[PDB]
Design an enzyme around this catalytic site. Structure first.
Site, PDB file in Angstrom:
ATOM      1  CG  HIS A  61     -35.722  13.281   1.418  1.00  0.00           C
ATOM      2  ND1 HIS A  61     -34.760  13.991   0.683  1.00  0.00           N
ATOM      3  CD2 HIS A  61     -36.268  14.157   2.288  1.00  0.00           C
ATOM      4  CE1 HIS A  61     -34.680  15.211   1.179  1.00  0.00           C
ATOM      5  NE2 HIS A  61     -35.578  15.330   2.166  1.00  0.00           N
ATOM      6  CG  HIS A  91     -28.341  14.037  -1.677  1.00  0.00           C
ATOM      7  ND1 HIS A  91     -28.142  15.395  -1.838  1.00  0.00           N
ATOM      8  CD2 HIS A  91     -29.131  13.668  -2.720  1.00  0.00           C
ATOM      9  CE1 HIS A  91     -28.744  15.792  -2.960  1.00  0.00           C
ATOM     10  NE2 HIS A  91     -29.342  14.736  -3.536  1.00  0.00           N
ATOM     11  CG  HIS A  93     -31.332  10.639  -5.716  1.00  0.00           C
ATOM     12  ND1 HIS A  93     -32.496  11.130  -5.191  1.00  0.00           N
ATOM     13  CD2 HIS A  93     -30.486  11.689  -5.791  1.00  0.00           C
ATOM     14  CE1 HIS A  93     -32.353  12.453  -4.970  1.00  0.00           C
ATOM     15  NE2 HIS A  93     -31.133  12.848  -5.326  1.00  0.00           N
ATOM     16  CD  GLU A 103     -33.058  12.036  -8.417  1.00  0.00           C
ATOM     17  OE1 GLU A 103     -32.382  13.074  -8.319  1.00  0.00           O
ATOM     18  OE2 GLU A 103     -34.146  11.856  -7.867  1.00  0.00           O
ATOM     19  CG  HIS A 116     -27.617  14.553  -6.939  1.00  0.00           C
ATOM     20  ND1 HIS A 116     -28.986  14.420  -6.853  1.00  0.00           N
ATOM     21  CD2 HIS A 116     -27.241  14.128  -8.174  1.00  0.00           C
ATOM     22  CE1 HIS A 116     -29.400  13.926  -8.009  1.00  0.00           C
ATOM     23  NE2 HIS A 116     -28.380  13.741  -8.830  1.00  0.00           N
ATOM     24  CB  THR A 195     -34.240  15.655  -8.423  1.00  0.00           C
ATOM     25  OG1 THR A 195     -33.528  15.230  -7.268  1.00  0.00           O
ATOM     26  CG2 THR A 195     -33.340  16.056  -9.559  1.00  0.00           C
TER      27      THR A 195
HETATM   28 ZN   LIG Z   1     -30.283  14.679  -5.310  1.00  0.00          ZN
END
Ligand SMILES: [Zn+2]
Ligand SMILES: NS(=O)(=O)c1ccc(CCNC(=O)CN2C[C@@H](COC(=O)O)NN2)cc1
Length: 257
Positions: A61, A91, A93, A103, A116, A195
């Site tokens: 992911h 990590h 996104h 996000e 994050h 999330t």
């Molecule tokens: Zn995250």
């Protein structure tokens, strides 16, 4: 299994994780004009001098940079928090193009990516216990925009070729996460959730107002990662973000005027 596709993406998650439609889901849009300055909020204390990175993992992911969280080596405190939160991993996104990927949004603006830094409240002893508590985690969110390179990101970028596919890991010692911070620690905060599944409502979100700049070439290397495992049909790891969720009965507080 859940993911980011048309068939298994965020609009499907509620079938296996019904808390997806809960009262304190993340991310959210930050309406800058509605967020109230809270003079009672403290300066963030980010204490990463003794951070010990260990490993980087492609989990299918995103990629996680993992830390030794067996002692108080890298901790977050102050700001809206009571007590001590230990850094476990960070990590990102990110998007398929620079105009999406974050996000959280700011007055509906999407950034190219969002970092994050995940911390757990040491009063609960272990991460698995902390995610079961409403004050179990503190996630520090930092927006990425595309412009100048972020020198402190390049060591992350350069290891990604070695963890291209799901389930690959690499040694990743001596990485200093202070090189990913912006100058200002001004922030917004609100109560929310993970999330990704399991979407647990255990997070105090702290979202920095100042983005960091990364280069086009840096984010292009994020977009060469794969969601798939080795030898499987190539699915580029892009658009691994959940869109903004309803704010419901929450207030977003600002640390700054
Ligand atoms: Zn995250
Ligand atoms: N994207 S986010 O909200 O920062 C975030 C999502 C998910 C996690 C990991 C959660 N992990 C468990 O619940 C069990 N280990 C940690 C952080």
């Amino acid at each position: 299994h859940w993911g980011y596709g048309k068939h298994n993406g965020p609009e499907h998650w509620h079938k296996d994780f019904p808390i997806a439609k809960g009262e304190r889901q993340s991310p959210v849009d930050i309406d800058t004009h509605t967020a109230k300055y809270d003079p009672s909020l403290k300066p963030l204390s980010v204490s990463y001098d003794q951070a010990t990175s260990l490993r980087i993992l492609n989990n299918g992911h995103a990629f996680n940079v993992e830390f030794d969280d067996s002692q108080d080596k890298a901790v977050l405190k102050g700001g809206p928090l009571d007590g001590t939160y230990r850094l476990i991993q960070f990590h990102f996104h990110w998007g398929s193009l620079d105009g999406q990927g974050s996000e959280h949004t700011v007055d509906k603006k999407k950034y190219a990516a969002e970092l994050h830094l995940v911390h757990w409240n040491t009063k609960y002893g272990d991460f698995g216990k902390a995610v079961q508590q409403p004050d179990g985690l503190a996630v520090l969110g930092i927006f990425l925009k595309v412009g100048s390179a972020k020198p402190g990101l390049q060591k992350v970028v350069d290891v990604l070729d070695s963890i291209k596919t799901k389930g690959k890991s690499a040694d990743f010692t001596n990485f200093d996460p202070r090189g990913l911070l912006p100058e200002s620690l001004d922030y917004w905060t609100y109560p929310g959730s993970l999330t990704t599944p399991p979407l647990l409502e255990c997070v105090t979100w702290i979202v920095l107002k100042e983005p960091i700049s990364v280069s086009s070439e840096q984010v292009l290397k994020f977009r060469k990662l794969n969601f798939n495992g080795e030898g499987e049909p190539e699915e580029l790891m892009v658009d691994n973000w959940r869109p903004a969720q309803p704010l419901k009965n929450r207030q977003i507080k600002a640390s700054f005027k």
